[PDB]
Amino acid sequence: DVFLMIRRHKTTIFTDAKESSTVFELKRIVEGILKRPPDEQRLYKDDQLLDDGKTLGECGFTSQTARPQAPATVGLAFRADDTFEALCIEPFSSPPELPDVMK
Amino acid sequence: MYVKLISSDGHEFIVKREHALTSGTIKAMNEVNFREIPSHVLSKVCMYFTYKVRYTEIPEFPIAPEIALELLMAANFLDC
Amino acid sequence: QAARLAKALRELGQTGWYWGSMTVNEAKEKLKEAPEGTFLIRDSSHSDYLLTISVKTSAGPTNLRIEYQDGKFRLDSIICVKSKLKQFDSVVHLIDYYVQMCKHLYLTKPLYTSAPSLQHLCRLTINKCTGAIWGLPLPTRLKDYLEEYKFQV
Ligand code: NI
Ligand code: NI
Ligand code: NI
- For residue A99, list chain C residues with Cβ-Cβ distance below 8 A: 130, 135-137
What's the number of CA atoms in the CB half-sphere (13 Å) around residue B23? 23
A60: left (phi over 0), alpha (psi -120 to 50) or beta: left
| Domain range annotation of chain A | 1-103
Instruction: Give the H or E element holding residue C140.
Output: helix C140-148
In chain B, how long is the greatest CA-to-CA distance?
Answer: 36
The ligand placed nearest to the CA atom of residue A7 is 1
Residue C75 phi, psi dihedral angles, 5° rounding: -65, 160
Residue C83 phi, psi dihedral angles, 5° rounding: -70, -30
Q: Which residues are within 8 A (CB) of A60 and not within 5 positions of it... i.e. 6 or more apart? A: A45
Q: Which residues are within 8 A (CB) of A37 and not within 5 positions of it... i.e. 6 or more apart? A: A31
Q: Best interface-test mutation with B: which of A14, A33, A102 has the largest number of B CBs within 10 A?
A: A14
First-to-last C-alpha distance (Å) of chain C:
25
SS3 of B17-33: the string is HHHHCCCHHHHHCCEEE
| Domain range annotation of chain B | 1-80
Q: What angle do CA C23, C110, B71 make, to 5 degrees?
A: 135
Chain B residue with the nearest C-alpha to that of C113: B58
SS3 category, B66: helix
> CATH topology for C1-113?
SHC Adaptor Protein (3.30.505)
CATH class label, A1-103: alpha beta
- For residue C142, list chain B residues with Cβ-Cβ distance below 8 A: 72-73, 76
Chain B residue with the nearest C-alpha to that of A89: B11
Q: What whole-number distance in Å separates Cα of residue A2 and Cα of residue B28? A: 30
DSSP-assigned states of every residue in C118-135: HHHHHHHHHHHH-S-GGG
SS3 category, B64: coil
- Structure-solving method: X-ray
Torsion of CA C40, C41, C46, C50, to 10 degrees: 170
Q: What whole-number distance in Å separates Cα of residue A44 and Cα of residue A92? A: 18
Superfamily of domain B1-80: Potassium Channel Kv1.1; Chain A (3.30.710.10)
Do B70 and A95 touch, CB atoms closer than 8 A?
yes
Identity at B66, one-letter amino acid code: E
The ligand placed nearest to the CA atom of residue C7 is 3
Strand partners, A11: A8, B12
Residue numbers followed by a gap, chain B, C–N over 2.5 Å: 29, 56
Do C115 and B51 touch, CB atoms closer than 8 A?
yes
Do B74 and B7 touch, CB atoms closer than 8 A?
no
Q: How many CB pairs under 8 A join A and B?
A: 72
* Ligand 1 center–CA A10 separation, angstroms: 7
Q: What whole-number distance in Å separates Cα of residue B63 and Cα of residue A12? A: 20
Q: What whole-number distance in Å separates Cα of residue B44 and Cα of residue C122? A: 11
Task: Tell me the shortest Cα–Cα distance from A32 to chain B, in angstroms.
Answer: 10
* Ligand 2 center–CA C83 separation, angstroms: 11
Q: Which residues are within 8 A (CB) of C56 and not within 5 positions of it... i.e. 6 or more apart? A: C31, C34, C35, C36, C37, C38, C39
Q: Which residues are within 8 A (CB) of B70 and not within 5 positions of it... i.e. 6 or more apart? A: A95, A96, B37, B38, B40, B41
Nearest to C36 by CA among C111, C106, C114, C113: C106
Do C59 and C52 touch, CB atoms closer than 8 A?
no
Of B14, B19, B43, the CB nearest to A92: B43
Q: What whole-number distance in Å separates Cα of residue C148 and Cα of residue A37? A: 52
C128, burial (CB in 10 Å: exposed 0-12, middle 13-18, buried 19+): middle
Q: Does domain C114-149 have CATH number 1.10.750.20?
A: yes
SS3 category, B68: helix
> From start to end of B1-80, where are the E strands?
2-6, 12-16, 31-33
Identity at C16, one-letter amino acid code: G
Chains contacting chain A through 3 or more C-beta pairs under 8 A:
B, C
Distances (CA, A) of C11 to B53, C16, C90, C149: 25, 10, 8, 6
For CATH 1.10.750.20, list the domain ranges present in chain C.
114-149
Q: What whole-number distance in Å separates Cα of residue C4 and Cα of residue A66? A: 44
- For residue C126, list chain A residues with Cβ-Cβ distance below 8 A: 102
Q: What whole-number distance in Å separates Cα of residue B39 and Cα of residue B67? A: 11
* Ligand 1 center–CA A74 separation, angstroms: 14
Q: Which residues are within 8 A (CB) of C11 and not within 5 positions of it... i.e. 6 or more apart? A: C90, C91, C92, C93, C148, C149, C151
Instruction: Give the H or E element holding residue C62.
Output: strand C60-69
- For residue B57, list chain C residues with Cβ-Cβ distance below 8 A: 34, 38, 111
Q: What whole-number distance in Å separates Cα of residue B67 and Cα of residue B3? A: 24
Distances (CA, A) of A42 to A26, A30, A55, A83: 11, 11, 15, 11
Q: At what angle do helices C2-15 and C91-101 cross, to 10 degrees?
A: 50
Do C109 and C95 touch, CB atoms closer than 8 A?
no
Of A14, A15, A92, the CB nearest to B40: A92
DSSP-assigned states of every residue in A39-79: GGEEEEETTEEPPTTSBHHHHT--TTTSBTTBPEEEEEEEE
SS3 category, B76: helix
Q: Which residues are within 8 A (CB) of C134 and not within 5 positions of it... i.e. 6 or more apart? A: C143
Q: What whole-number distance in Å separates Cα of residue B61 and Cα of residue B63? A: 7
DSSP-assigned states of every residue in C3-61: HHHHHHHHHHHHHS-B-TT--HHHHHHHHTTSPTT-EEEEE--STT-SEEEEEEETTEE
Contact A69 B51 (CB under 8 A): yes
